[PDB]
């Protein structure tokens, strides 16, 4: 996750999986701003309650999301979605790196072991 | 010590001009139809300028965009063959030039009806070809063509002229030889009025002449926008008489 808008969410592409797991991470350096970046729009986070969408309650900066390509979009970014019960948040550290590692409580929620603190993320089905 | 003769006691200048006289003054309209809808050519003596105007149109970037009015870009091209002695380096970020690039903007922030051209771009292209001194007011008179050359919305004519001072005596329409010889002032004069757009003094001036000095250039400046007008009009007659 790169930046959180009220409109939308912005990420950069890092790693592509494959079909019949088998992956392909990009070997690029993001510190150049090199890599391909994409955009998740906030209504495209999920389809259940797709109108009254609260974006902060699913994402924070720097976090890992199993997301599906929607389409190409522009040349600048991508059209992207997470709108499934198996998709969404993979992993982040607490308070965006300011704390320890966090585990998805449900498919729908996430906590942290040592802390006793939870946060709302649109977690993936594990 | 100059081995030459600045101004005669018999009233004459280098070509024999009087102190209240002009060079040959020639404009032209629609010099480049295939290039832009603003295209005008100046000869004021050997000051020769190609003047080009682009707009009102879409920007290159949405960053450079306003939702209120137009923008105005000034791009000055001084060639290395503009003078007698060929200049070595290029000028394209020279801090002398950028001043004028600032200058014509604020001179022309206030003729353009900016509000009625929003979200669009006006670009003014300059090509200085042959340089004869009096260089500042040479430009402005070329500008006033080029905006009318597309017929952009405006208030008025705007005239420009450098007028020099040999010791007591004003000199309408100096040249670069005279420019390096004495003190000069250029006036950016608006229409028929007594109000100024441009006023720029580099040289050192005794105070007491200056009111009189300023009182000189208006009659010159009024004869400028005079000669611009009919010269456009005789062009303007040439359209519809052969269009229709």
């Amino acid at each position: 996750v790169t930046r959180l808008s009220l409109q939308r969410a912005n990420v950069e592409i890092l790693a592509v999986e494959d079909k019949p797991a088998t992956f392909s991470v990009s070997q690029a350096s993001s510190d150049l701003g090199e890599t391909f970046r994409g955009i998740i729009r906030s209504q495209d986070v999920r389809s259940t309650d797709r109108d009254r969408v609260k974006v902060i309650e699913c994402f924070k900066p720097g976090d890992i999301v199993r997301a599906q390509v929607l389409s190409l979009g522009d040349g600048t970014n991508y059209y992207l979605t997470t709108a499934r019960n198996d998709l969404g948040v993979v992993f982040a550290r607490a308070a965006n790196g300011a704390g320890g590692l966090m585990y998805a409580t449900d498919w729908q929620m996430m906590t942290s072991p040592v802390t006793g603190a939870t946060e709302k993320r649109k977690c993936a089905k594990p | 010590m100059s081995r030459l003769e600045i101004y005669s006691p018999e009233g004459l200048r280098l070509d024999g001009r009087r102190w209240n006289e002009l060079r040959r003054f020639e404009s032209s309209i629609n010099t480049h139809p295939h290039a832009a809808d603003g295209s005008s050519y100046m000869e004021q003596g050997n000051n020769k300028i190609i003047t080009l105007v682009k707009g009102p149109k879409e920007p290159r970037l949405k960053s450079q965009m306003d939702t209120s009015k137009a923008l105005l870009n000034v791009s000055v091209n001084i060639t290395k063959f503009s003078k007698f002695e060929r200049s070595k380096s290029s000028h394209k970020n020279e801090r002398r030039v950028l001043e004028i690039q600032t200058s014509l903007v604020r001179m022309f922030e206030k003729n353009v009806m900016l509000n009625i051209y929003p979200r669009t771009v006006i670009d003014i292209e300059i090509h200085v070809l042959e340089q004869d001194g009096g260089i500042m007011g040479s430009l402005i008179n070329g500008i006033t063509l080029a905006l009318i050359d597309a017929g952009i919305s405006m208030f008025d004519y705007i005239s420009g002229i450098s007028v020099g001072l040999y010791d007591t005596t004003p000199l309408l329409d100096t040249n670069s030889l005279e420019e390096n010889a004495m003190s000069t002032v250029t006036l950016g004069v608006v229409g028929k009025s007594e109000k100024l757009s441009l006023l720029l003094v580099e040289d050192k001036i005794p105070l007491d002449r200056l009111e009189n000095v300023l009182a000189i250039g208006i009659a010159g400046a009024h004869r400028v926008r005079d000669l611009m007008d009919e010269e456009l009009r005789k062009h303007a007659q040439k359209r519809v008489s052969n269009a229709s």
Partner: protein
């Protein structure tokens, strides 16, 4: 990086001029009070006009002259803005317009005008001369920088001294500083610039074809004052009543008869402030010499 002001606040000041008021407490044609204070170094000064604060520095060193004028020494003024003095500014934009509007003035105010004898920088012709340097720093803006940097540079030239020199071909003998005294510099004339600040209370046309001159001009725009002004004009003069530069580069249209009537009032202003510098240069050097009297009797 954009200053945002309400149009409600825009009308407010514009009303205050329409009832002959301005927010600072000065008159329209009144200038701020100037605090000049020197550091211990020569060519060291802190100059302060209320809110606007500046600092500059004069130095010199040895170099060869150009081929261009092989007679004369070398000199240039740096005026690099730091965004310290206000968050509007880029980190050292030498290509911004207002910077150039600060630049070319002081370029013409000093260099093309020649207050300073560059020929008195010629140590030896074509071999070794002086490279005199003027770094202008801005501290905090309330406008009047180009008038402040007008002053603070010319303040600095009347406080710098250069050390002692002896020539034998290549054997060029720069002496120790404290045995052989530093030597001040030659000023041909003292220029003082004046900012003029312009406000149409009307539309364009009543300035254009409204024959009635109705345009208010004030001195030393404060920060909020400066953000709404319509034309920009600076003149510069001396004590010998000659006009150094004038620059109205566009903006609002403006009557000629105003400008002479403007520039006369400049004269009485700048003269009093000029002499205030002149005493303080003396009086500090008097305080230098009275403390030099408080030194040799002490030592």
């Amino acid at each position: 990086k954009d200053i945002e002001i309400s149009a409600s606040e825009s009308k407010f000041i514009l009303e205050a001029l329409r009832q002959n008021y301005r927010l600072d407490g000065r008159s329209f044609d009144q200038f701020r009070d100037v605090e000049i204070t020197f550091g211990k170094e020569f060519g060291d000064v802190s100059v302060k006009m209320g809110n606007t604060k500046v600092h500059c520095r004069i130095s010199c060193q040895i170099a060869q002259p150009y081929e261009d004028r092989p007679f004369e020494g070398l000199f240039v003024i740096s005026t690099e803005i730091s965004p310290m003095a206000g968050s509007q500014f880029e980190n050292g934009n030498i290509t911004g317009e207002d910077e150039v509007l600060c630049s070319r003035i002081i370029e013409k105010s000093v260099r093309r005008s020649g207050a300073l004898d560059v020929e008195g920088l010629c140590i030896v012709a074509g071999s070794k001369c002086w490279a005199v340097r003027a770094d202008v720093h801005f501290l905090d803006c309330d406008g009047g920088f180009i008038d402040a940097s007008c002053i603070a540079v010319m303040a600095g030239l009347m406080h710098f001294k250069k050390p002692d020199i002896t020539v034998h071909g290549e054997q060029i003998i720069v002496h120790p500083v404290n045995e052989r005294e530093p030597v001040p510099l030659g000023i041909l004339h003292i220029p003082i610039c004046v900012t003029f600040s312009f406000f149409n209370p009307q539309d364009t046309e009543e300035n254009i074809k409204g024959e009635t001159n109705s345009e208010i001009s004030i001195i030393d725009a404060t920060l909020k004052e400066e953000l709404l002004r319509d034309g920009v004009l600076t003149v510069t003069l001396n004590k010998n009543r000659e006009v150094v530069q004038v620059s109205k580069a566009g903006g609002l249209p403006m009557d000629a008869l105003t400008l002479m009537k403007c520039c006369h009032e400049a004269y009485s202003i700048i003269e009093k402030i000029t002499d205030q510098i002149l005493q303080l240069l003396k009086e500090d050097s008097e305080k230098r010499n009275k403390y030099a009297a408080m030194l040799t009797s002490e030592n």
